[PDB]
Design a protein around this ligand. Structure first.
Ligand code: NAG
Ligand code: NAG
Ligand code: CL
Lengths: 233, 201
């Protein structure tokens, strides 16, 4: 039993207050104001339409919904509609809006929630229960798995650590590239914002293991990828 | 006299290391135990998973928790899985743990940060709808603030984990209650409680 996430938008709550104070006096009998608003508050305080709902939304989804609703609400108030005509249009409208919004939510859940396929993506969500906006950690396997690379001798080796979702992840730091030696030591060979490591004009000495670590504001890494390099003589 | 039998050991449940020892790397919230742990790297990672394979108990049952709250629960797991200082409270049900005294701050903070999150039950140890492989709230169980179902910190500490923990009136650094998390920089404050309790003077 949860609020319609749309009320986490400030313009919506102000539109609704404006409806109460600016629209109701000229358009609905005074004896109905009290109960009308109770009914509207409750329309927004429970969202029954919801793939189990997790109670969260991204800013984009919230905006897509709020913009839809605000537009249609002002369409009602601009029309100057009154009395039972008004009452009926409004609740009718709200119902339809909730449905449309439901759709936007299911879309968000299946398409924009934790879209990473490995590693850990941090993403800001808004919790509908309390309008509180915080960062969620999207955890998929610890790994992102090995790359086989074979490079013709004396061409350039490019190791790409970038995954689709990185540009959208929040709280990321740096791409660390390590070479992994046969005696179980490692050398940090680069550490920076560049998602690829380029090594030009390669020879056999460049064969072996490399590991990429994409760092996070948190303790542990967001993405780990291992590369095994064979140099073709 | 001194219960050394009861010190520096790991319980025999399915995931635990047979004996404690240091780890090169443990994930996030389990880092404080890397000095000497009953959890492997894998275990420490698994603890952070939504519906972690360790228990197949879903925390999302009333919707995703606030991250602050989720953090507390993960720490609870890290502690249970990683602590080498649990001997005095180990008992067989193949072993489990009963009424580990968690310091009041640990239960208070936990409770505080989970107030805004939602659950449907106050005794999580059983009575769930189990059909999907994961628990869902049973027919007609209302999703409401944690502060409704767990009116007190004590309720939360104790009942979520089937009385694995006891909310202690003792506070932190009394020498007589354990912390479910501690800053790794500052060194493990639970070692000496174990010792006290092994002897249990
Ligand atoms: C380990 O092996 C690498 C590569 O063979 C070598 O350069 C390095 O000196 C060795 N490191 C140590 C610490 O012995
Ligand atoms: C958790 O789920 C897995 C995968 O479906 C299952 O095989 C396993 O028995 C469950 N784990 C525990 C600890 O019960
Ligand atoms: Cl400990």
């Amino acid at each position: 039993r949860s609020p319609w996430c749309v009320i986490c938008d400030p313009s919506v709550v102000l539109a609704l207050k404006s409806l109460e104070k600016d629209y109701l006096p000229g358009h609905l009998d005074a004896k109905h104001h009290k109960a009308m608003m109770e009914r509207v508050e409750n329309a927004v305080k429970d969202f029954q339409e919801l793939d189990a709902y997790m109670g969260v939304v991204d800013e984009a989804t919230l905006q897509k919904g709020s913009w839809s609703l605000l537009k249609d609400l002002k369409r009602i108030t601009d029309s100057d509609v009154k009395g039972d005509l008004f009452v009926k249009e409004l609740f009718w409208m709200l119902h339809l809006q909730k449905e449309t919004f439901a759709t936007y939510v299911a879309r968000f859940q299946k398409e924009a929630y934790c879209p990473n396929k490995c590693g850990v993506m941090l993403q800001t969500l808004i919790w509908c229960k309390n309008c509180k906006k915080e960062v969620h950690a999207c955890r998929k396997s610890y790994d992102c798995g090995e790359r086989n690379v074979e490079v013709p001798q004396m061409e350039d080796m490019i190791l790409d650590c970038e995954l689709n979702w990185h540009q959208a992840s929040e709280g990321l730091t740096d791409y660390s590239f390590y070479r992994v030696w046969g005696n179980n030591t490692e050398t940090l060979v680069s550490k920076g914002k560049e998602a690829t490591l380029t090594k030009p004009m390669v020879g056999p000495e460049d064969a072996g293991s490399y590991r990429c670590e994409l760092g996070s504001v948190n303790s542990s890494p967001a993405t780990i990828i291992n590369f095994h390099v064979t140099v073709l003589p | 006299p001194w219960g050394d039998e009861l010190l520096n050991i790991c319980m025999n449940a399915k995931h635990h290391k047979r004996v404690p020892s240091p780890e090169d790397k443990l994930y996030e919230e389990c880092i404080p135990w890397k000095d000497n742990a009953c959890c492997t790297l894998t275990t420490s990672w698994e603890a952070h998973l939504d519906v972690s394979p360790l228990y197949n108990f879903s925390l999302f049952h009333c919707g995703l928790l606030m991250p602050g709250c989720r953090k507390h629960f993960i720490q609870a797991i890290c502690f249970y899985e990683c602590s080498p200082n649990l001997g005095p409270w180990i008992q067989p049900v193949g072993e489990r743990v009963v009424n580990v005294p968690l310091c009041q701050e640990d239960c208070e903070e936990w409770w505080e940060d989970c107030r805004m999150s939602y659950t449907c039950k106050s005794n999580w140890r059983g009575g769930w709808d189990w059909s999907q492989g994961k628990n869902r709230c049973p027919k007609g169980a209302q999703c409401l603030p944690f502060s409704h179902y767990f009116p007190t910190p004590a309720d939360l500490c104790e009942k979520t984990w089937s009385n694995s923990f006891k909310a202690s009136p003792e506070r932190r650094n009394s020498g007589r209650c354990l912390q479910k998390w501690f800053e790794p920089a500052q060194g493990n404050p639970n070692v000496a409680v174990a010792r006290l309790f092994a002897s249990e003077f």
